[PDB]
Amino acid sequence: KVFGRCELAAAMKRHGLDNYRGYSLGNWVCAAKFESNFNTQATNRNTDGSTDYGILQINSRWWCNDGRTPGSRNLCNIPCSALLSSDITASVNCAKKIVSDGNGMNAWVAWRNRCKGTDVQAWIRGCRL
Ligand SMILES: [Cl-]
Ligand SMILES: [Cl-]
Ligand code: NA
DSSP, X not given: OBOOHHHHHHHHHHXXXXXBTTBXXXXXXXXXHHHHTTBTTOEEEOTTSOEEETTTTEETTTTOXXXXXXXXXXXXXXXXXXXXXXXXXXXXXXXXXXXXXXXXXGGSHHHHHHTTTSOGGGGGTTOOO
8 A cells, every 4th residue: 555645644543653662753754755655565675684664664574574584583573464464563663663673764774864854743644633
């Protein structure tokens, strides 16, 4: 599923990400934009052989099992395929764990390089929330 911008802002709000660990809604929408272009089916293989899954490109090296990332962990306790669903539950719940783990949203390189310190409220401007 490719979400619309305000459609995803709303879904992320309903799923509990507005101001989660202190990050406003616009930070999450910006990260999803640059991670996946709002596409729940996005996958991108990393040089280390791990793979990134979903709207927030959660990596199999730490967070999910895909059965093909030697030596990896599965800290969110899900199959990586769960992160590809039209329903963003598994992505949001795993992203909550990630953002809680010490480096906040810097875990998402694309947030750090493209959203961090910008006017992220622009990503929610004009959405019915
Ligand atoms: Cl594996
Ligand atoms: Cl933080
Ligand atoms: Na894994």
